[PDB]
Enzyme design. Sequence first.
Site: not given
Length: 283
Positions: A180, A214, A220-221, A261
């Site tokens: 998370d 994602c 994440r992508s 990110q």
Amino acid sequence: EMEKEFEQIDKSGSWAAIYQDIRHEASDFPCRVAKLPKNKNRNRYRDVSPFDHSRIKLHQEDNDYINASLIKMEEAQRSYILTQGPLPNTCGHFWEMVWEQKSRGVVMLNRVMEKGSLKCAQYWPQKEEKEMIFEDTNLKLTLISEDIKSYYTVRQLELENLTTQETREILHFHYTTWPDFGVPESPASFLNFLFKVRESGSLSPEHGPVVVHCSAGIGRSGTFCLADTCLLLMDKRKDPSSVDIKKVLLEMRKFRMGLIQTADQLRFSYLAVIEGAKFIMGD
Ligand SMILES: [Mg+2]
């Protein structure tokens, strides 16, 4: 070599500084279609938009817009579609894009619920006998089989174009153990997942580009594509330490904003590429 570059940044704890130079140097292109008012409900996040020049167009006359970008890595001979997690009203558009682009695989890097909120619509069937129909785009989706493992799940899906009665088999690769908060402690399970996607043929040029998502399709992508492309370029080149992760990332950011990110994600990407290099150099 970048293994040495990694230790310098980590010794001086200057990841946030590297990450900021990347942000200031990243491309900026117009995203006019995304910001039209008729498309406001097709966007999950107001600040995450596809550039007009690389956006995927749906073959609908009404509205061709989906929040999805084509990333083309010419040297590596890889293409990816990066997209947001579908919304309740864009599930049909998502599968229409998969159909139109002739993709073989979907890579999902998030859970439907994270941090107590919904990050993605449940856009695939949970049981063999309960198929899903997308009335707006005339597509039927059936779960054929489901292989659950510790860190990821692979599903075989059948996508049927109800108009033409043609069917295709789609593979759904679902990484289920991304935490998370932050990033995985070791890249091992991430690299294992990446090599399973590779082994399936989903990244291969006989097929349409893989769809990766994602929640926003950038964090994440971005890590997934960046690691894959960097490892591929190391296979190809005469000098494998000529691969500059930062350069590769800026080239990908010409196609979709914001890839990677956080500084934590940048560090993780270095780590995965460095560890993955062990297996690409013949070990
Ligand atoms: Mg059952």
